[PDB]
Design a binder for this molecule. Structure first.
Ligand SMILES: OC[C@H]1O[C@@H](O)[C@H](O)[C@@H](O)[C@@H]1O
Ligand SMILES: [Mg+2]
Length: 745
């Protein structure tokens, strides 16, 4: 049955577009071109962003191109500028084609490419909140502020499995667990789109699930190099968030640029047409990632010509090509259709999907609109939500002697290269693609230094970085200036405590590839030199990947992992360090300790017959929580039962906080060697000092199924254990079920 209901009025409109459209118009609707192609750059340098009328005439008038993407001039623009540009684009599209353009933008964590928007912590941070509602509210705000520039389509959310800490895109998704990505991805989709996928309202956008699928586990750790994914992992884990999002009505999917089992995913008919469109009966849009049809020819050599690559990818089930420079795509596809290599059935289906999306977004009736009414843009109300997200994502990993919180009045030596910059805090997909320009445009927001000054007074903060990042040149995200560790060491005698901010500078995608996961040698020497002053040290980790720090964690009294908390991350940190907020974040991935002992939390028991830095689900706070009375309604169950778990959680310390309650399962014996432990549900609860609450968490029996060797889901007769916080119970499945459908439920 269709995952998104059929709107007959939309289908009727589509049928009558398809009867009347020229082949050139149809092909144009399957083509997407990046904004640079239609930009007048010399006039833009002098007078601000300006489109080229002549190039619009070519792209839209002659070739009938149905979609544009990307940020004008490679840098975030004012919403007024966005709106003026999209207006001109739509006036042209309605005049020459009669079909409105769909403009896609990478608004990744709030409005990446719209100035003065509300910027949220990155995906990995949102995972660490274990707060679905907060993720939803973040996406709702991003949608609102995206539509404030007349943009209807966001290339988000990202639901790759961040299971490889070498990978430059580990931070874009919600971490290493497939359940966390599925649930948060669904929360983002609901926020972005609203509750009716057929009528995306004024303040909502179409979501795009990225990057279908298995993108996050390249064998070498290098971006867009081959993964080697097992049959069971592909169905059970990598597919899981896409399955969940599509069933909630996500309107579009972007395909994985990379390769597995010798096949680029853009050429994988089975995964695109069968697993996605046909098995789920899903009428949404599949779009390529950047240049990926041409990559079949030039990068991977599975096509002799670009034209042969078009044939392969379109026949594999792609609907729209992110070319993104060459209107010649249209010529090639037309030739293929005339030759009989690509059928009209396939062209008509692609165009149906493009038009359907456009109708769902109301673009025929409202191709652009007045933006005056979007008066909550950049508001205090929206910022308080981003601040909450940031507070809830920053993880307390170590606190010996309860050195935190730090009392107002103590003198703080602030050190390290991540201590005074918004570029660090944001990472990539922030004002520019690499994030390199963040400090030019993020002056209204607080760096770590600025926030600590507001909390403790400028007079109580001594800032001597010792090590700083070099100025931007050719994606030198790794490069630091010569260390001057001599300086903060000398200044230490005047401080009570040292906070050292370390990790990475901003990068995005392939330029962010690393050759050594170990934290920078200069950064490690800075921490060692400071340790030897005898003053206590608090490490602040600000990075897109968990850099190896096994030699410096023993020298630190406390450690806070902020990951990429973005524009309110400095404020959040200061609020947490002073106890005005209480820590609640938990690790959404496994932090490795040794460079050739990398592992995820759901390892097979042969892997621990297990030496890591901090595990998945770990996080401290300024209070403690007791779990008791773990019960279930049906201790003996089958696939079709609803299991209802309850547990009492009591705040036994002296201050209020939020506890993320995680529910894990363990299959003791199975026909495939079972994951040692698996997250199955979670729920976050607020508790005052001394307060108990009964937390309810529900599962279907079939949630304890796994994908067997033969590719089929099975729930087997036998024993399981359930772990919730500190507490364990026994349950029994009383009968085996094997599914003949590709998916459960
Ligand atoms: O910018 C459009 C697309 O281009 C590619 O570089 C990235 O992999 C995608 O995440 C992005 O949505
Ligand atoms: Mg079993």
């Amino acid at each position: 049955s269709p995952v998104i209901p059929t709107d007959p009025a939309i289908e009727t409109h589509i049928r009558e577009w398809l009867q009347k459209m020229t082949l050139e118009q149809k092909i144009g609707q399957m083509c997407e071109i990046t904004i640079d192609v239609v930009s007048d750059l010399e006039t833009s340098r002098k007078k601000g962003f300006c489109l080229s009328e002549a190039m619009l005439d070519t792209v839209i008038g002659k070739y009938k191109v149905g979609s544009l993407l990307n940020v004008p001039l490679g840098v975030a623009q004012k919403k007024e500028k966005w709106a003026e540009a999209i207006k001109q684009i739509q006036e042209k599209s309605m005049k020459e084609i009669g079909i409105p353009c769909i403009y896609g933008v990478d608004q990744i964590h709030g409005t990446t490419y719209t100035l003065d928007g509300t910027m949220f912590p990155q995906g990995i941070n949102m995972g660490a909140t274990f707060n679905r509602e907060l993720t939803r509210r973040g996406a709702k705000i991003s949608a609102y502020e995206t539509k404030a520039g007349c943009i209807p389509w966001t290339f988000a959310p990202v639901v790759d499995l961040g299971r490889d800490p070498r990978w430059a895109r580990m931070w874009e998704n919600y971490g290493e667990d497939c359940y966390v990505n599925a649930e948060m991805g669904v929360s983002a989709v609901k926020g972005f789109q609203g509750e009716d996928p057929n009528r995306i309202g004024e303040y909502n956008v179409a979501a795009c699930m990225k990057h279908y699928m298995g993108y996050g586990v390249p064998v070498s750790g290098k971006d867009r190099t081959p993964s080697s994914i097992s049959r069971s992992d592909m169905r059970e884990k990598h597919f899981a968030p896409f399955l969940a999002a599509v069933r909630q009505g996500a309107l579009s999917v972007m395909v994985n640029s990379g390769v597995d089992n010798g096949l680029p995913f853009h050429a994988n008919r089975e995964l695109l047409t069968e697993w996605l469109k046909e098995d789920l009966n899903w009428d949404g849009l599949i779009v390529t990632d950047w240049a990926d049809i041409n990559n079949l020819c030039t990068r991977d050599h599975i096509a002799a010509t670009k034209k042969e690559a078009v044939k392969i990818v379109i026949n594999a089930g792609i609907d729209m090509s992110m070319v993104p420079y060459e209107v010649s795509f249209c010529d090639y596809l037309k030739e293929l259709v005339e030759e009989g290599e690509v059928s009209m059935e396939r062209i008509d289906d692609a165009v149906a999907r493009v038009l359907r999306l456009k109708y769902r977004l109301g673009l025929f009736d409202h191709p652009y609109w007045d933006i005056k009414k979007y008066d909550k843009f950049g508001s205090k109300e929206f910022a308080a939500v981003a601040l909450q997200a940031a507070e809830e994502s920053e993880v307390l990993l170590k606190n010996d002697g309860n050195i935190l919180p730090i009392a107002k009045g103590k003198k703080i030596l602030l050190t390290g290269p991540n201590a005074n910059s918004m570029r660090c805090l944001n990472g990539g997909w922030s004002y520019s693609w690499q994030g390199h320009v963040a400090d030019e445009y993020a002056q209204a927001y607080h760096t770590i230094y600025e926030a600590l000054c507001e909390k403790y007074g400028k007079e109580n903060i001594i800032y001597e970085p010792g090590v700083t990042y070099a100025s931007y040149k050719n994606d030198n995200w790794w490069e630091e200036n010569k260390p001057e560790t001599e300086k903060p060491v000398a200044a230490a005698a005047q401080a009570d405590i040292i906070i050292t901010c370390i990790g990475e500078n901003s990068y995005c995608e392939t330029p962010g590839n690393l050759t050594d996961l170990t934290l920078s040698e200069n950064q490690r020497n800075l921490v060692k030199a400071l340790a030897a002053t005898g003053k206590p040290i608090v490490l602040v980790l600000n990075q897109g990947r968990p850099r190896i720090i096994n030699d410096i964690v023993p020298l630190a009294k406390a450690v806070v992992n902020i990951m990429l908390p973005s524009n309110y991350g400095g404020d959040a940190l200061a609020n947490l360090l002073a106890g005005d907020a209480n820590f609640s974040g938990k690790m959404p991935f496994t932090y490795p300790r040794l460079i050739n002992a990398l592992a995820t939390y759901d390892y097979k028991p042969c892997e621990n017959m297990m030496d890591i830095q901090w595990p998945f689900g770990f996080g401290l706070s300024y209070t403690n929580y007791k779990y008791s009375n773990l019960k279930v309604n049906k201790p003996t169950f089958n696939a079709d039962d609803e299991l209802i778990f309850t547990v009492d959680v009591t705040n036994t310390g002296k201050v209020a906080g939020k506890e993320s309650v995680l529910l894990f399962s363990k299959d003791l014996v199975a026909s495939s060697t079972p994951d040692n432990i698996r997250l199955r549900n979670f729920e976050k609860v607020s508790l005052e000092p001394g307060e108990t609450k009964t937390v309810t968490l529900k599962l279907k029996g079939s949630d304890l199924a796994f994908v067997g060797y033969d590719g089929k889901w099975r729930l087997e007769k036998g024993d399981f254990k359930i772990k919730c916080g500190d507490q364990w119970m026994d349950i029994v499945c009383d009968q085996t079920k094997v599914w003949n459908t590709p998916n459960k439920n």
